[PDB]
Amino acid sequence: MSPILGYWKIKGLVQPTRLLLEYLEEKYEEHLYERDEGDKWRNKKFELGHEFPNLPYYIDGDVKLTQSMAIIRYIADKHNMLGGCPKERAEISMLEGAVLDIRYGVSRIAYSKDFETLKVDFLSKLPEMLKMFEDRLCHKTYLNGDHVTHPDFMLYDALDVVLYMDPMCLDAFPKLVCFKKRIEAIPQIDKYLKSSKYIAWPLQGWQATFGGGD
Amino acid sequence: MSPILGYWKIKGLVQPTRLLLEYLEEKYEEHLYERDEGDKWRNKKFELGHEFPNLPYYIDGDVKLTQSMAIIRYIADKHNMLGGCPKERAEISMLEGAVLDIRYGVSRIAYSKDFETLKVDFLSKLPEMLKMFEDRLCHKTYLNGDHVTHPDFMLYDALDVVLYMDPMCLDAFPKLVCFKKRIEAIPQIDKYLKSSKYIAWPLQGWQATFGGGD
Ligand SMILES: N[C@@H](CCC(=O)N[C@@H](CS)C(=O)NCC(=O)O)C(=O)O
Ligand SMILES: N[C@@H](CCC(=O)N[C@@H](CS)C(=O)NCC(=O)O)C(=O)O
Questions:
Q1: Does the beta-carbon distance from B96 to A67 stay under 8 Å?
Q2: Does the keyword Transferase feature in the UniProt annotation (chains A, B)?
Q3: What are the extents of the domains in chain B?
């Protein structure tokens, strides 16, 4: 009747999947769980018809999905965006994982009681990872050349988070600073970011030391 | 000249990729880094021709890969094992991620100074995740029906690790206990496990609290 996507009303793990959607102009509704609704999830968690219950979920009627990365890859696969030959898939997946080292690097520490000191060790390695992305862009509009691919949205999302973490981490990465602006200047994403549908905060689950609250 | 796969001489993140290989009878050589060889990696790390240097790496000459999950998906894609329609990819990827919640659950805590207490909270949630896998198998030889898929090897690997963690965690999961035996009873894997080529330990990087040492 119309694709469903369920998650907490935070950016978290599905923010990118949201942006891919907006970029594709796919129609979808959203089940959004408020912080105060742990019980509500707990019940609809057990009955939606999933074999690996979890959040986020994505229901096409055609399918019932539960893993964050499958859900986004499945959207891209619906639109023939995962790659033609293997060398292509494989490489998209590489960008994928490389962007996940950054986004998970953040997530891994955000809910710990030692965040501020774990912080110092992440921003240290970050540049290193940041750079690979900069060099990758010395010659390609987007992460995989001309045509947008889902990790361009992963990558977007990751810069957005690290910037709240250290506003300057992209001083020294002009190429990355233009990519974040570019993705922004794309009409569909342009609209979504100023739409009512946009969720600007929290970055992580609310309880989180970093990116928590309101 | 012959596919290369490089990693530390531990099971770690590539053990499953190794098992897929052995199951496919693909020929490959291995660059194995001993614990004492951090400097050696550090030099060959910078020159192999990778845009996202890292371990593991997989060099087909046809391609130069670096993310653990892409490398294994790329092997499966070489053999037409990632799925026919999208509903297929998507679902394989689901098994994928669901098995990664378990394997990363372990990895996330193994190198921490509070392991033993973090331990207690993992084995708690484990059953929950374990079960999804058991129910998934009430009616399918393998994780995706009759034909073996790469998460069957991920899943294998994950049971192997958690068993060193708690030898009984599979009492209560007879269906899972037969799957671990089955995968074992497959001639190719049968051979590899008793071959010289097999790496039985360490589970994690050597420095690790859990699964470290020799
Ligand atoms: N690996 C999974 C992780 C899922 C996950 O950790 N979900 C959390 C939110 S960050 C959820 O609260 N779990 C809901 C539940 O377990 O019922 C994915 O990529 O989707
Ligand atoms: N997300 C990456 C993680 C890679 C990774 O963490 N590799 C560690 C071993 S567990 C390696 O020592 N990094 C080597 C390096 O950074 O040079 C993957 O899936 O391959």
A1: yes
A2: yes
A3: 2-81+187-213, 82-186
